[PDB]
Design a protein around this ligand. Sequence first.
Ligand code: HEM
Ligand SMILES: C[C@]12CC[C@H]3[C@@H](CCC4=CC(=O)CC[C@@]43C)[C@@H]1CC[C@@H]2O
Ligand SMILES: [K+]
Ligand SMILES: [Mg+2]
Length: 406
Amino acid sequence: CPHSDTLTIDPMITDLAGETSRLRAAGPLTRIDLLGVPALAVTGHTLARQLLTDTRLVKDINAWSLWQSGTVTRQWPLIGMIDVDRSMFTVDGPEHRRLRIKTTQALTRRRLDALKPTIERYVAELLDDLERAGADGAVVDLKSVFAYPLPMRVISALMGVPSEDQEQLLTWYKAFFSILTPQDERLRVIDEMHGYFTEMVRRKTAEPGDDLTSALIYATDGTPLTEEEVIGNLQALVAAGHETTVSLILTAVRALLSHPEQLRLVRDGEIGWETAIEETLRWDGPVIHLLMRFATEDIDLGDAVIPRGEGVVMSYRAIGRDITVHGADADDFDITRATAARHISFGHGPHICPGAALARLEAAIALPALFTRFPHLHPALPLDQIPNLPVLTQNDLSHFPIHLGR
Ligand code: HEM
Ligand SMILES: C[C@]12CC[C@H]3[C@@H](CCC4=CC(=O)CC[C@@]43C)[C@@H]1CC[C@@H]2O
Ligand SMILES: [K+]
Ligand SMILES: [Mg+2]
C-alpha cells in the first residue's frame, strides 16, 4: 500500500469502495491496470460526457495498439468483453444507427406497455416462489429465487428465447463473467454461446414470431442486417438485458433496507419508486467499468493527451460518486438529492443504453411488488457482509439472505 501511479483493479473485488474512491481522487483520467494490461480510466462526469461523444474514440478492437502488436490475445481473461461479433456494441459512425434502430424502436416506453403484463406475471410468479421458500421463517436467497431469474425471463420473452433454454444461458453467463473460470473453459463457453444464438437465429428465420429477434431478421424499414449482426445484437441484448438488471434490483433492495427511513419515503408515496431507482443507479449501479474504447489518433485534452492506439475505459461507478456534480455527500445514498437523475450510469452519446427504459420498468414493477407483498422483509445477514462475485466489470452481488418477516 505504497504509492503507485498505475491503479490495479483487483479482480477479487476485495475493496470496491476504496478502489472507487482511489479512482476518483486520481481522476478524472488515470492509468489503470487490468489483469496485467494497461489502459486509461475515465473517472470524471464531465470528461466522460465529452469523450463518449468524441468520434476519435472507437469500439473496434483493431484500433487497439496492443491488439495490433499482438501483446494482447484471446488468453486475456477479459477478452470476451470487447472482442465480440459485429453489432451495435462494436460499431461507430453512420453504420451504427442502422444497427440500433429496430431495437430502440422496440424498446420505447410506449412499445414496452405491451410487455408490461408479462413482466407483472413473472414478478408475481417469483414472489410466489419467495413465499414458499421463506415459509416457516427460513432464510431465503433473494437473488437466486427472485432477482436472478426475473430479468432473464423478461429479456427471453422480448428476444424469443424458449423457456427451456434459459437455465443453460444462465449457467454460461455465470462462467463467462466470473474471473475464476479457466480461460480455456471461458473461450469454450463463448463458442457454445455463439453456437446457440446462431441456431436461434436460424430457427427464427425459418419460423419468425412476435419477438424482437424476428424483427432484427426481417426488417420492413426496407439493407437487411447480416447474420453476424443479428446474432451480434441478440447476444448484446440478452447478456446486457440480464446481468445488469439483476444487479439493479438487488442494490435497490440493499440500499433501501439499509436506509429504512428512505424506504418509508417511497412506500408512503412522498418520493417515487422511480427516483429511488435513479439514485441507486447513481450510487450503486450495475456497471463498474465499461471496456473499452480506442483512440484513432492523438486526443488532446489541454493538460493531458490520449495517444493514438491507447485503450480507454469508462469507470461508471466512480463517475456516479463524482463530488463536483453531486456534492460532498456523493458517497451517501439519498433518494431526495437534487441530482438523483443526473447520472450517466446508462452511458452517454450514440452508444447510450437502448434498454434503459426496460430496466427502469422492470425495477419499477419489481420493487414495490416485493415490499408490498412482504412489508417486513429484512436481512438474515448483515447487508454490509454481502460480498461481490469476482466479476471485475460488473456490480454482481453473490447472494442476498433475507427473512420474509411478520
Ligand atoms: C440496470 C440496468 C442497466 C445498466 C446499468 C445498463 C448500462 C449500460 C451501459 C453503461 C452501456 C454502454 C455504455 C457505453 O457504451 O459506454 C449499455 C449498452 C447496451 N445496453 Fe444497457 N444497461 C442496463 C440494462 C440493459 C437492458 C435491459 C438491455 C436490453 C434489454 C441492455 C442492452 C444494451 C445493449 C445491447 C448495449 C450496447 C449498445 C451500444 O453499444 O450501442 N442494457 N448498457
Ligand atoms: C458490458 C455489458 C456486459 C457484457 C456484454 C455487454 C454487451 C455486449 C456483450 C456481448 C457479448 O457477447 C458478451 C457480453 C457483452 C460484452 C454489456 C453492456 C453493458 C454490460 O455492462
Ligand atoms: K470474434
Ligand atoms: Mg506518483
